[PDB]
Symmetry: C2
Subunit: 286 residues, 2 copies
Amino acid sequence: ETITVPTPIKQIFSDDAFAETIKDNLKKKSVTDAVTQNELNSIDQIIANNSDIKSVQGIQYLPNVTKLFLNGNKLTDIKPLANLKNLGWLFLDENKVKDLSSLKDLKKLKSLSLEHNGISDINGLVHLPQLESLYLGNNKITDITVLSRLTKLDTLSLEDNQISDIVPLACLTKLQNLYLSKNHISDLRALCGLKNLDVLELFSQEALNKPINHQSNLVVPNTVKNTDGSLVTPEIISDDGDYEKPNVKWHLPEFTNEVSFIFYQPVTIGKAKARFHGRVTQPLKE
Amino acid sequence: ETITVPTPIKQIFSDDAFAETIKDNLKKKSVTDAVTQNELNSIDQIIANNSDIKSVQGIQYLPNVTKLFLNGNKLTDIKPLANLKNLGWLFLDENKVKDLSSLKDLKKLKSLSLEHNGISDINGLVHLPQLESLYLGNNKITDITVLSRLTKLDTLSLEDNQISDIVPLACLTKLQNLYLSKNHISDLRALCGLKNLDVLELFSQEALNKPINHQSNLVVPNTVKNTDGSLVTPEIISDDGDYEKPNVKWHLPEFTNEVSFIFYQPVTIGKAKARFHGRVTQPLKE
């Protein structure tokens, strides 16, 4: 519905914090002040960090907006963004946005940040093949299958998720910056071909094996593989265990519901030097 | 032991066919003719195809040899090659050479062919990091872990082996020509990053699942993955079965010890167009 007469900012922008934002963006005195379509048309960029915004309702009326800095807010619904056709940059860290269908037709969208949103299903990213930078740190992502389509990415952050299978990243040969700390990664082989990498982080993995039965002499295959497929030699083994390539071996006269080992290994891919470090946890039954 | 007087070709080269070869190489009249170290020193290249040679004993006395065309012979031991330090090209198709330790210090060796030798263990190839072309078609290779070190390869043939896991090839970003027909491959994802490929062959895979129990309504996960991780849609399904993404489903009122499906899908990697085609066989118990 068209704004055919000057209309109070608060009648368009139902959220009180977001009305304050539009107010300061346009250098108005008060949220009750009136705005025109013409003033709203002038807005290229909204800086709205850390404002406890719960809804961007009314943002549909800003059609020329190219940049949205919405980090540190309380948003759960980004449907109103759906028709911001010239949106290039969207930063939504620390909200709780899980429905990403709303981005599916933002064809100019080049940079997206959705850190700390509690997201598991990233399948909607598949509609954004033009993306150049994507930050998804600190979520609950396990399956990154769909990322294989995002071959324009030069920067990708997946730190602090639940990812064990990094095979999908092998398509992404343009990547220069890749952050994979605090995942569940134990097998680096499928990264070996990313020779444009400049920066890579791989610290503090938590690899979890499927449980096996407890026995008093337990032999467990080392599953930690460097980019060349060599087994990584554990540096510390729990419960007085021993390494005998290719197996970690424990004497457990008494039952314990887990054992584990820590590894640490420098790794080079392309021009990037990382520290592949972590722990493999082995749960036990019976 | 030094050749200090002209010595009959047959006293140096114990194998009758190989003595004939040295004889024609040097344009002598008879195998009983005498040769000097000086004539043997002049030999750069030996063409010995299809001669039923059973031993190259005496070849140690040809130190300047750079090229050995030994295809179509009956060799089982290539120890005498061990000190041919300037050997650049070695073609041993259709012999039965399984001990490759003898090549470990041939630092100039750039091209190697060992097709049709009945080889399973290719771990000795790891000492040949300089290799540029490697042909291993028609053997019994399952595990190509060590190939990840051969990053100078521009041409690699692994056709007609027993390979299911092609993850190791992801390191090999220089590859231009890659032949993988008639293996056991079902998952192409780890190839996606090989963007220098020019020629690629992937036809007639035979993927084999681990057996599962027979049931009269059998649901089996499609495991065939394109380079982007998408499931490949079966084109023909045995025993009147049906596809319901992501599962192949059969009604088997009566027991049968296997079912299967055929797939066929064009695939592009780098500048290379292949036809990923094959069959997945599913054996059944009880």
